[PDB]
Design a protein around this motif. Structure first.
Motif, PDB file in Angstrom:
ATOM      1  N   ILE A   7       0.830  -1.197   0.000  1.00 24.33           N
ATOM      2  CA  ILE A   7       0.000   0.000   0.000  1.00 24.33           C
ATOM      3  C   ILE A   7       0.870   1.255   0.000  1.00 24.33           C
ATOM      4  O   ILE A   7       0.517   2.249  -0.647  1.00 24.33           O
ATOM      5  CB  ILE A   7      -1.014  -0.009   1.164  1.00 24.33           C
ATOM      6  N   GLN A   8       2.027   1.228   0.676  1.00 18.01           N
ATOM      7  CA  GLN A   8       2.850   2.434   0.696  1.00 18.01           C
ATOM      8  C   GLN A   8       3.532   2.658  -0.641  1.00 18.01           C
ATOM      9  O   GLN A   8       3.860   3.801  -0.973  1.00 18.01           O
ATOM     10  CB  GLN A   8       3.910   2.414   1.803  1.00 18.01           C
ATOM     11  N   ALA A   9       3.740   1.598  -1.428  1.00 16.95           N
ATOM     12  CA  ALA A   9       4.251   1.786  -2.781  1.00 16.95           C
ATOM     13  C   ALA A   9       3.284   2.617  -3.615  1.00 16.95           C
ATOM     14  O   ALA A   9       3.685   3.582  -4.279  1.00 16.95           O
ATOM     15  CB  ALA A   9       4.508   0.430  -3.439  1.00 16.95           C
ATOM     16  N   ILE A  10       1.995   2.275  -3.558  1.00 10.25           N
ATOM     17  CA  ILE A  10       0.989   3.001  -4.324  1.00 10.25           C
ATOM     18  C   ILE A  10       0.820   4.412  -3.780  1.00 10.25           C
ATOM     19  O   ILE A  10       0.680   5.375  -4.548  1.00 10.25           O
ATOM     20  CB  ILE A  10      -0.335   2.221  -4.338  1.00 10.25           C
ATOM     21  N   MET A  11       0.852   4.557  -2.451  1.00  5.74           N
ATOM     22  CA  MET A  11       0.853   5.881  -1.834  1.00  5.74           C
ATOM     23  C   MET A  11       1.988   6.743  -2.365  1.00  5.74           C
ATOM     24  O   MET A  11       1.772   7.896  -2.757  1.00  5.74           O
ATOM     25  CB  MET A  11       0.966   5.745  -0.313  1.00  5.74           C
ATOM     26  N   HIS A  12       3.196   6.184  -2.420  1.00  6.58           N
ATOM     27  CA  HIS A  12       4.357   6.957  -2.833  1.00  6.58           C
ATOM     28  C   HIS A  12       4.279   7.339  -4.305  1.00  6.58           C
ATOM     29  O   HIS A  12       4.582   8.484  -4.665  1.00  6.58           O
ATOM     30  CB  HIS A  12       5.631   6.169  -2.546  1.00  6.58           C
ATOM     31  N   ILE A  13       3.864   6.407  -5.172  1.00 10.28           N
ATOM     32  CA  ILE A  13       3.861   6.737  -6.595  1.00 10.28           C
ATOM     33  C   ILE A  13       2.769   7.753  -6.897  1.00 10.28           C
ATOM     34  O   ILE A  13       2.982   8.681  -7.683  1.00 10.28           O
ATOM     35  CB  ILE A  13       3.720   5.490  -7.488  1.00 10.28           C
ATOM     36  N   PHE A  14       1.595   7.614  -6.269  1.00  7.96           N
ATOM     37  CA  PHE A  14       0.540   8.603  -6.474  1.00  7.96           C
ATOM     38  C   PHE A  14       0.957   9.971  -5.955  1.00  7.96           C
ATOM     39  O   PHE A  14       0.739  10.989  -6.625  1.00  7.96           O
ATOM     40  CB  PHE A  14      -0.754   8.151  -5.799  1.00  7.96           C
ATOM     41  N   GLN A  15       1.586  10.012  -4.776  1.00  9.70           N
ATOM     42  CA  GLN A  15       1.970  11.281  -4.173  1.00  9.70           C
ATOM     43  C   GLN A  15       3.048  11.984  -4.988  1.00  9.70           C
ATOM     44  O   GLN A  15       3.034  13.214  -5.115  1.00  9.70           O
ATOM     45  CB  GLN A  15       2.439  11.043  -2.738  1.00  9.70           C
ATOM     46  N   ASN A  16       3.994  11.228  -5.543  1.00 13.33           N
ATOM     47  CA  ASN A  16       5.021  11.854  -6.366  1.00 13.33           C
ATOM     48  C   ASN A  16       4.508  12.213  -7.757  1.00 13.33           C
ATOM     49  O   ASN A  16       4.951  13.213  -8.332  1.00 13.33           O
ATOM     50  CB  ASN A  16       6.242  10.940  -6.476  1.00 13.33           C
ATOM     51  N   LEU A  17       3.580  11.426  -8.306  1.00  7.99           N
ATOM     52  CA  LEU A  17       3.140  11.626  -9.682  1.00  7.99           C
ATOM     53  C   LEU A  17       2.084  12.721  -9.777  1.00  7.99           C
ATOM     54  O   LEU A  17       2.295  13.743 -10.437  1.00  7.99           O
ATOM     55  CB  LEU A  17       2.615  10.300 -10.243  1.00  7.99           C
ATOM     56  N   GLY A  18       0.946  12.530  -9.127  1.00  9.79           N
ATOM     57  CA  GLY A  18      -0.108  13.516  -9.157  1.00  9.79           C
ATOM     58  C   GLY A  18      -1.322  13.063  -9.943  1.00  9.79           C
ATOM     59  O   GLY A  18      -1.613  11.872 -10.079  1.00  9.79           O
TER      60      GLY A  18
END
Lengths: 85, 73, 73, 85, 171
Positions: free
Chosen positions: E4-15
């Protein structure tokens, strides 16, 4: 000029626009027009048709047609005119 | 009233609706507000309602307010 | 008539029928549209008592009375 | 605005005064009666505390007794809440 | 947690460009919601609030699902602070279509007010800071909490008393 200008602007024919009776054309025991087997043959039941069609630029412009089947699998034919088949 | 009447006689109906494409400055949800003057843009394919149905219905509705005004879209 | 001052009421509602009808509909817009986080604007500004005027309740009851007849029909 | 006050007797008699005035100047009374009827009907089902339920129910009793003009057309919405209680 | 933190990180960095996968991710997260101990439910709802604070409106075909999740999981053992954080985040990210479902969150707010007020009433203070954010939204439902916040200005302590009267004034 006007007819040959509007004719390449119909890439999809609407079922209710071309025939109101096609909406009620269902629940008929006639099978899909490609199935025939003497002796052992399951009954093919025509259920529904999608409202949308399509045309292909061929100088005679055939119509791709599909039928929702009682087996749950779509049956796709192509209708041609002005050409003996 | 001093009987000085500034009548309205002519109307311009600017309808910048190219149905199918969205501006690049506003994000959209996949289901969005799309009906326009009580005619739906999915029941008509490309351009039978881009102007020549929406504007017809809009002109017919504007006729109710004043029938003595001519319209051209 | 109740909300507006008299010179503005004369300028906007008694002179010509087309503009009178459009501002009549704008009075309805100034109540319906702010229910959805959008505030309309007029060029001659209007007092904001329109959207909180107590008299709209009778119009709502009129719709209720007609729609009851529609549903029982 | 005395329809919403501290002691319940104030509400019980104020709604009776409103019901009595519902045939004197009805143009400025009946829509407000509709508004407070809708407010009470919303609270009666979206509230979850027995004393509030009690007050809403008997306020509806005294209103429906004190005014017959706002009574008849609203029988279906006023029964759809009370009947499953 | 890593998944879940992988998806959190990619969404947060990407937008706001990976938003086409919302038809898969949130149905993929409700199944994780369904069968899990309360140990990581706080973390899950915190990360869902993080999703909401960056993706605002495209949650619209799933907001009924997130209130369904809260409704069949609204106990005391769930972090009420995290739940009200989720509510304030979705309300702020939505901002206007809230009319369809004011009574649900409003009854949840009643339950939170009337359940626990311990440790200096930090959760009542947060809920009184949350009710004021709703803005013009209470134009037709201002008969449930307004008597309640009128009542709780003399039937409680003085730490949240001024909070209640400030809530009254701001509303």
């Amino acid at each position: 000029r006007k007819i040959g200008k509007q004719l390449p602007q119909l890439q999809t024919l609407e079922l209710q626009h071309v025939s109101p009776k096609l909406l009620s054309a269902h629940d008929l025991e006639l099978a899909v027009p490609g199935t025939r087997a003497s002796g052992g043959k399951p009954i093919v039941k025509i259920s529904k048709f999608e409202p949308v069609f399509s045309v292909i630029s061929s100088k005679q412009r055939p119509r791709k047609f599909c039928i929702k089947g009682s087996d749950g699998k779509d049956y796709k034919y192509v209708l041609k005119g002005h050409e003996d088949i | 009233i001093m009987k000085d009447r500034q009548k309205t006689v002519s109307a311009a109906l600017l309808l910048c609706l190219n149905l199918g494409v969205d501006p690049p400055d506003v994000m959209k949800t996949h289901p969005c507000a799309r009906v326009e003057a009580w005619v739906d843009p999915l029941n008509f394919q490309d351009s039978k309602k881009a102007i020549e149905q929406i504007g017809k219905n809009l002109q017919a509705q504007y006729e109710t307010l004043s029938l003595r005004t001519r319209y051209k879209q | 008539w109740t909300s507006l001052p008299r010179p503005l009421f004369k300028k906007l509602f008694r002179h010509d029928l087309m503009i009178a009808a459009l501002f009549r509909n704008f009075l309805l817009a100034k109540r319906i549209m702010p229910w959805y986080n959008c505030h309309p604007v007029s060029d001659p500004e209007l007092p904001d008592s329109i959207t909180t005027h107590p008299m709209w309740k009778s119009w709502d009851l009129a719709m209720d009375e007609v729609l009851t007849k529609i549903v029982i029909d | 605005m005395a329809l919403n006050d501290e002691i319940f007797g104030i509400q019980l008699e104020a709604i009776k005064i409103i019901g009595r005035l519902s045939s004197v100047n009805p143009a400025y009374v009946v829509p407000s009666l509709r508004k407070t009827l809708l407010e009470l009907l919303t609270q009666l089902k979206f509230s979850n505390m027995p004393k509030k339920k009690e007050e809403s129910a008997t306020l509806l009793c005294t209103l429906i007794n004190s005014s017959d003009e706002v009574a008849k057309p609203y029988i279906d919405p006023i029964l759809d809440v009370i009947l499953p209680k | 947690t890593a998944a879940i933190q992988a998806i959190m990180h990619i969404f947060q960095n990407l937008g706001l460009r990976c938003v086409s996968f919302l038809d898969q991710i949130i149905p993929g997260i409700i199944l994780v919601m369904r069968s899990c101990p309360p140990s990581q439910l706080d973390f899950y709802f915190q990360q869902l609030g993080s999703l909401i604070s960056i993706v605002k409106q495209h949650i619209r075909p799933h907001v009924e699902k997130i209130y369904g999740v809260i409704r069949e999981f609204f106990p005391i053992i769930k972090l009420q602070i995290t739940i009200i954080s989720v509510i304030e985040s979705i309300s702020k990210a939505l901002e206007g279509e809230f009319k369809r479902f004011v009574p649900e969150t409003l009854t949840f707010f009643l339950d939170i007010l009337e359940n626990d007020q311990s440790n200096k009433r930090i959760v009542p203070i947060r809920i009184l800071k949350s009710l004021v954010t709703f803005g013009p939204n209470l134009e037709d439902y201002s008969h449930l909490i307004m008597p309640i916040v009128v009542r709780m200005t003399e039937y409680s302590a003085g730490s949240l008393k001024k909070i209640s009267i400030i809530t009254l004034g701001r509303l």
